[PDB]
Amino acid sequence: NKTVIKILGLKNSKAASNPDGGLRSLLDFLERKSKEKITLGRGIIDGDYVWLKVNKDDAQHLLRLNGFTYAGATLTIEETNEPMP
Amino acid sequence: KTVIKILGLKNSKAASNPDGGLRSLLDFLERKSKEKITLGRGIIDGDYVWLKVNKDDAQHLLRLNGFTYAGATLTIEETNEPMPA
């Protein structure tokens, strides 16, 4: 089944000044870093978080990337049963 | 010494505990291993539980990978990641 992932720290990063807030570049970075071949299509920014809806296997791959540094900011990745905003 | 990462406590019923269910989890791990293991240093960081243990202890903990605790599937893994302060 599907799962919701929250990513924190993009706003604090250097990528934040981008037109889209650095959203796509973040998702692109996550795809490269996992090396499991994760595919991130749609993501959104609500509040300080970046929200992703993914399958169970994908969720584990993202959680592995927790604590990595992106654009000069530490990424915090969390699984949640919260409804997608 | 070895570092162990545990995932799935947040999804469990013990998550609502005062200490996040850390103590109940470690208590469960000690009993389930049947080695009469003593778990010294542990912490909750993000969705993960971190444990610092000797090598033989790690093997018994690793056997419990995939087991269900408090209604949540546990993913137990060894890592060379530094333990967070």
Numbering used by the authors:
A (entry chain B): 97 to 181
B (entry chain A): 98 to 182
The authors write:
The Mex67–Mtr2 complex (NXF1–NXT1 in metazoans and small bristles in Drosophila melanogastor) is the principal mRNA-export factor in Sacccharomyces cerevisiae. Mex67/NXF1 is a modular protein constructed from four domains: an RNA-recognition motif (RRM) domain, a leucine-rich repeat (LRR) domain, a nuclear transport factor 2-like (NTF2L) domain and an ubiquitin-associated (UBA) domain. Mtr2 is a ∼15–20 kDa protein that also has an NTF2-like fold and forms a tight heterodimeric complex with the Mex67 NTF2L domain.
Like other NXF family members, ctMex67RRM did not contain a typical RRM consensus sequence that is based on two motifs: RNP1, (K/R)o-G-(F/Y)o-(G/A)i-Fo-Vi-Xo-(F/Y)i, and RNP2, (L/I)i-(Y/F)o-(V/I)i-(G/N)o-(G/N)o-(L/M)i, where the subscript ‘o’ or ‘i’ signifies whether the side chain is surface-exposed or facing the core of the RRM fold. In ctMex67RRM the RNP1 (residues 143–150) and RNP2 (residues 101–106) sequences were G-Do-Yo-Vi-Wo-Li-Ko-Vi and Ii-Ko-Ii-Lo-G-Li, respectively. The RNP2 motif appeared to be more conserved than RNP1, although the characteristic aromatic group at position 2 that typically forms ring-stacking interactions with RNA was instead lysine in ctMex67RRM. The large deviations from the RNP1 and RNP2 sequences found in different members of the NXF1/Mex67 family may reflect that they bind RNA in a more general, non-base-specific way, as appeared to be the case in the crystal structure of hsNXF1RRM-LRR–CTE-B, in which the hsNXF1 RRM domain formed mainly phosphate–backbone interactions with the CTE-B RNA. The UBA domain showed the greatest conservation (29% sequence identity over 55 residues), whereas the RRM domain had the lowest (15% identity over 73 residues). Classically, binding of the RNA cargo has been attributed to the RRM and LRR domains because together these domains are sufficient for Homo sapiens NXF1 to bind the viral RNA CTE (constitutive transport element) sequence motif.
